[PDB]
């Protein structure tokens with residue numbers, strides 16, 4: 508039945524959007540100059556609608572939201588409305604140090620200041 | 631094992647990037663006013679390095695290329711370097727009409743004029 | 754060690770994926786003008802296995818399963834879902850209903866085949 | 876040279892069977908309630924021809940053998956004839972404790988008691 512066929516298309520497309528919502532965004536992590544920088548491909552979002560935060564845990568969290576409204580017949584709606592990404596941080600980040608987030612060309616770049624030395628424990 | 635672990639980690643990172651290369655970009659497709667619109671999330675790319683193609687078989691093809699060079703330690707390399715996506719268009723493209731592609735905020739917007747007909751039963 | 758922990762989890766999944774691609778091994782032979790396909794497909798629900806014949810003459814076996822365990826897991830190799838496409842050496846008989854039987858982790862499929870090929874005359 | 880092609884095919888079939896023998900069977904290992912459990916997919920084997928052994932070195936060994944012969948033309952013979960798999964257990968096996976092996980639906984399940992301890996900090 509066509510009605511049956513149509514429903515499947517809707518479900519697949521919705522599954523697709525969700526899959527992207529979990530996967531996006533891919534990130535690159537590297538440490539440079541005592542600086543930890545995270546780069547994320549995050550196309551089509553407002554700067555206001557993006558939030559970057561650090562938990563006390565050294566976890567790095569990225570949240571973004573958008574509304575997409577299209578007028579016309581719709582064949583696919585893959586793009587993710589809602590983004591939540593939680594990122595493990597390899598090393599402890601200096602407390603009370605400036606953190607820079609810049610949003611360019613759909614790319615979110617985060618620089619975290621890096622502390623070189625680790626106090627180690629005896630016994 | 632230490633060397634092996636590093637090689638393996640490097641291998642694992644390569645796979646993750648490859649997975650992204652396969653799934654990016656997500657696209658939205660909708661048609662209004664005899665126009666088909668494709669919207670794709672393609673962050674962190676250069677317009678000069680992006681190619682958009684229309685095919686005789688009615689596919690739309692998007693190719694993206696970029697160079698990633700990183701200085702210092704690398705913890706993650708998820709972000710895609712090479713993009714190849716082939717989309718089978720729902721509607722036949724108009725044979726002789728202008729086709730437009732734009733790149734803003736990491737988003738590639740493609741507009742294609744469309745050829746179509748629907749038949750009305752005569753009573 | 755957490756990342757080392759991270760590496761291990763991925764390797765295990767990669768392993769699971771590898772099994773999903775390879776499983777199952779196939780034995781193919783022709784008996785009595787029938788094509789018999791035997792696949793080793795352990796621990797799957799019979800209700801959960803689908804066998805179908807392609808227009809192109811490919812033979813397809815589909816199976817999926819859920820595996821859930823309680824406690825620490827050291828390995829999860831076993832395949833959750835298998836999609837296998839088999840190209841068929843001989844043209845399949847039209848009509849000619851085909852039967853599938855599943856026992857002891859083994860799925861056996863019997864297919865009738867046309868015994869002759871007509872030849873075009875130029 | 877079609878017959879030589881056939882010999883080559885027979886060799887290739889032979890290799891495939893060999894590769895499978897190396898990779899079969901895939902195993903699931905989990906430890907719960909002092910029992911370590913191994914689940915392996917070993918379809919189409921006689922119970923009598925399957926051997927399960929526990930090693931001094933703490934390995935678990937699975938051995939199986941089968942006879943496969945067919946009548947008429949053979950197009951493929953992937954399925955393994957003889958199986959040897961050595962698994963090194965994550966945790967110590969409890970000495971002289973009952974171990975159970977069950978084979979059903981082509982699945983071999985092995986239950987092994989383990990010796991382990993954890994230390995609780997005092998005060």
Ligand SMILES: [Ca+2]
Nearest residue numbers: 510511514515
């Ligand atoms: Ca319905």
Ligand SMILES: [Ca+2]
Nearest residue numbers: 573574575576
């Ligand atoms: Ca609103």
Ligand SMILES: [Ca+2]
Nearest residue numbers: 889890892893
């Ligand atoms: Ca051999």
Ligand SMILES: [Ca+2]
Nearest residue numbers: 892893896957
């Ligand atoms: Ca051998």
